[PDB]
Amino acid sequence: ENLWVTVYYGVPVWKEAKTTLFCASDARAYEKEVHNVWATHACVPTDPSPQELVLGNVTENFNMWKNDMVDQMHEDIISLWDQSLKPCVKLTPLCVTLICSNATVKNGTVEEMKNCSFNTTTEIRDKEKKEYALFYKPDIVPLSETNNTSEYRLINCNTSACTQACPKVTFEPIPIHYCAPAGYAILKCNDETFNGTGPCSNVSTVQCTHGIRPVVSTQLLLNGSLAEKEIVIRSENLTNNAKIIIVHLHTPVEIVCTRPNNNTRKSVRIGPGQTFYATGDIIGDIKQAHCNISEEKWNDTLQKVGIELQKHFPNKTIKYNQSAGGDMEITTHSFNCGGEFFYCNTSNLFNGTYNGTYISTNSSANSTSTITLQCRIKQIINMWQGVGRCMYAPPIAGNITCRSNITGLLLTRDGGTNSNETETFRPAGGDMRDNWRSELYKYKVVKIEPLGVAPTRCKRRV
Amino acid sequence: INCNTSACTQACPKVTFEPIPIHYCAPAGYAILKCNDETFNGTGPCSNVST
Amino acid sequence: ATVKNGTVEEMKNCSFNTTTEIRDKEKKEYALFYKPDIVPLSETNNTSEYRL
Amino acid sequence: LGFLGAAGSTMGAASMTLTVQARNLLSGTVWGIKQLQARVLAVERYLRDQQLLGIWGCSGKLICCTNVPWNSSWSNRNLSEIWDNMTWLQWDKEISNYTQIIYGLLEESQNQQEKNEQDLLALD
Amino acid sequence: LGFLGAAGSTMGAASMTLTVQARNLLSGTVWGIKQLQARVLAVERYLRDQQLLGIWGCSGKLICCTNVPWNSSWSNRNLSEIWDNMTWLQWDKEISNYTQIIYGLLEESQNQQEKNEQDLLALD
Ligand SMILES: *[C@@H]1O[C@H](CO)[C@@H](O[C@@H]2O[C@H](CO)[C@@H](O[C@@H]3O[C@H](CO)[C@@H](O)[C@H](O)[C@@H]3O)[C@H](O)[C@H]2NC(C)=O)[C@H](O)[C@H]1NC(C)=O
Numbered sequence A: 001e002n003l004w005v006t007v008y009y010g011v012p013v014w015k016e017a018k019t020t021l022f023c024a025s026d027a028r029a030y031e032k033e034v035h036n037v038w039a040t041h042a043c044v045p046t047d048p049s050p051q052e053l054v055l056g057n058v059t060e061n062f063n064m065w066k067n068d069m070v071d072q073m074h075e076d077i078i079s080l081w082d083q084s085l086k087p088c089v090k091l092t093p094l095c096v097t098l099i100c101s102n103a104t105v106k107n108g109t110v111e112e113m114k115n116c117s118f119n120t121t122t123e124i125r126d127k128e129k130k131e132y133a134l135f136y137k138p139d140i141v142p143l144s145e146t147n148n149t150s151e152y153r154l155i156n157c158n159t160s161a162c163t164q165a166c167p168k169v170t171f172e173p174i175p176i177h178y179c180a181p182a183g184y185a186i187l188k189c190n191d192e193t194f195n196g197t198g199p200c201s202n203v204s205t206v207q208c209t210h211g212i213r214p215v216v217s218t219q220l221l222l223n224g225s226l227a228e229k230e231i232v233i234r235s236e237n238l239t240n241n242a243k244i245i246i247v248h249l250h251t252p253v254e255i256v257c258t259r260p261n262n263n264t265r266k267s268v269r270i271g272p273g274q275t276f277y278a279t280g281d282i283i284g285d286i287k288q289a290h291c292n293i294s295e296e297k298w299n300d301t302l303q304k305v306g307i308e309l310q311k312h313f314p315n316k317t318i319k320y321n322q323s324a325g326g327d328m329e330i331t332t333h334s335f336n337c338g339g340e341f342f343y344c345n346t347s348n349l350f351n352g353t354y355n356g357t358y359i360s361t362n363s364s365a366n367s368t369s370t371i372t373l374q375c376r377i378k379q380i381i382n383m384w385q386g387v388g389r390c391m392y393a394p395p396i397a398g399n400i401t402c403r404s405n406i407t408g409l410l411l412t413r414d415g416g417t418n419s420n421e422t423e424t425f426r427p428a429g430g431d432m433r434d435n436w437r438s439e440l441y442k443y444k445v446v447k448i449e450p451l452g453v454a455p456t457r458c459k460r461r462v
Numbered sequence B: 001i002n003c004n005t006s007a008c009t010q011a012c013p014k015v016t017f018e019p020i021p022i023h024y025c026a027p028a029g030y031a032i033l034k035c036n037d038e039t040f041n042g043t044g045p046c047s048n049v050s051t
Numbered sequence C: 001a002t003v004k005n006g007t008v009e010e011m012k013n014c015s016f017n018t019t020t021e022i023r024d025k026e027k028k029e030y031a032l033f034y035k036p037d038i039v040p041l042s043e044t045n046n047t048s049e050y051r052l
Numbered sequence D, E: 001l002g003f004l005g006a007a008g009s010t011m012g013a014a015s016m017t018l019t020v021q022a023r024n025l026l027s028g029t030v031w032g033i034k035q036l037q038a039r040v041l042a043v044e045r046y047l048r049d050q051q052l053l054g055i056w057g058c059s060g061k062l063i064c065c066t067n068v069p070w071n072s073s074w075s076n077r078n079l080s081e082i083w084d085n086m087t088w089l090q091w092d093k094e095i096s097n098y099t100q101i102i103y104g105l106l107e108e109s110q111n112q113q114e115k116n117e118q119d120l121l122a123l124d
């Protein structure tokens, strides 16, 4: 028999390509107000249907690093946040001299914040009145290059102008579903042991992705998804000692955080009809902010991670260590929860090391004991470079507490020397793409090419 | 009386507040139905309806 | 500053008080401006007080 | 079986149930301008493919066999091994080189038969 | 008679002059982004209905009778009393429940015909 040309439409064929995925969220947020929360101010009500579908005979090379969804998530969150700061007050009257008092305590320890006064312009342009506010030290810098023990400045006003966060909006990470327009499909890996790049022998298709948490943290990956059956170590290239290595845990480690001080809300009219906020007197006794982690659980976590860091470094030691250094934003485990920006020192979480000896995990002497991380709090924040980089976070009155689950680590392997066999890992700060890359790893977008051509046994009946 | 509450704006001198009439109407695939019974209570059926 | 005989193409050296990073502190400063962008300020006679 | 439910099924088993994959190519929901872009882009893609099908004479689409003969230099492969036990997604990676050639012939053949639709009807 | 000029007329009398109502479903004129959204929404709606008609095999639309047999449990009403002296707007309020069932059958029947359009043409 002969063979001619025939055309089919509606064929399953794929090619991966760029596309802007639109954000969706569950319907309960869509009765809310403007800018509260961003998850509803710029998204659409999601639908659980259609449910996940599995492709019964497939092979597609997913890639966690050569991916463009994280780029879109970065761009969208920057633009969304920069839009969210527009209706807020911009604090330009606060670029004034601050005269501060020098209360002091000696012996033991103390955690004071300064009490600084400053002339303010009231509702009347040409009439002023004396005032005061309490500020944490990191946001206060001495003004004059000449010696003066009392005249200070806000750390801004040398760099760009600087804005207060609106009091009606929140930083709460409401989950987000990214999903594709018509003519595109989201392909989902479903093999639990997936290295991150290379083929998935089990591949699926979904309408909209699982709820991602736009949550910010540097050294510890907070509330999020958990691994399937074991810890997975994932890096773009493990022959490179500079690249960020992502460790995604199986079991979570619970962490509680608290600021015990019973702070007070103080308000200040600054110009016609807008109010600057500040902390008044501290009620009760002054105490230290901190976060607690159970010690045996951390030993178990770091030991299980050590078992898999030695799948690539078998003979050698793993030797965890302190952050390398740098500025306060680079070294600390910065996070926001409860509305106040914490910056916790992590040096006690990485003080010893699994030495190949997998020391016995049970029976624990006292599992209720914990290891405490001391923390410092800021009000002026530089969240990302260039996106209206200030946000003055208005203080929250009262004492606050926060409870969350650890789910992953960002680490880094230090530079070797002298052919050292005992080489060391460390916590790693990184760009936020690294943070979200731990969550969008499962997904890739494909275009549908529904037109195909084939040989067939029929001819057109002309 | 302001400056205790929000800041406050002058009306532009070139624009006017004159109520010029406005016609609202629908895109394709939609139609406007008009009741044409003069005694209409406001709600309930209209025995004479137009487009 | 003035020159006589021949020709001269000079531009003015004008000082002006400026608000620094601090709102309520000021410092003395100067800049050179071409004359077409500099106009005398007062309608009354003054040989030194100018405006943009 | 859903949207791509026949992906990986045999080309014979995947050549049916085409409508469920044809019915999904048109939809829409927007925030902002940059997703309205995607919406009109998708509408444009659908209309482009429909216009291409019409130019070949396969209007009222879905399956439409034709007259542009299968030159052997396009496949050089056996009919059973390509239809019974190959899949469309991996059939593309065997014929993707040569579709763009076939489309032009497949237009001019429509022209060549519409000429007869003109002439023979005029003579009758 | 205009746009909805046959609304209220008999189903027989309203089954004609369908073009004047089919011709009004496409138009556009916009201020701002929200009316542009309305415009593209209308275009999408038209294309969705056209694609649905094509999936049933009623391309070149307007009136198109079929094979999917009228199950008696859909109407149970006499032909004269429904065609001569009912109007379409109040016919919907007698059959609105059961159209969504019929559409899937009306797709798969077209599939079951396209199978023969393939097979019998191949054998000839
Ligand atoms: C931060 O510093 C400010 C001043 O720089 C402190 O506010 C001042 O507090 C004192 C003590 O209460 C006030 O003076 C008192 O006023 C009462 C009037 O009932 C009088 O009887 C006392 O003899 C005494 O003069 C003072 O008015 C007040 N200043 C202002 C501008 O309100 C503030 O307490 C300091 N806060 C901390 C936490 O150190």
Ligand SMILES: *[C@@H]1O[C@H](CO)[C@@H](O[C@@H]2O[C@H](CO)[C@@H](O)[C@H](O)[C@H]2NC(C)=O)[C@H](O)[C@H]1NC(C)=O
Pocket (backbone or CB within 6 Å): A260, A399, A400, A401, A402
């Ligand atoms: C402010 O501090 C008080 C006292 O430390 C907290 O009160 C305790 O809260 C825990 C839960 O976090 C309860 O189990 C206790 O029963 C509470 N009372 C005491 C005496 O401990 C209070 O929770 C803190 N505020 C916030 C917002 O966390």
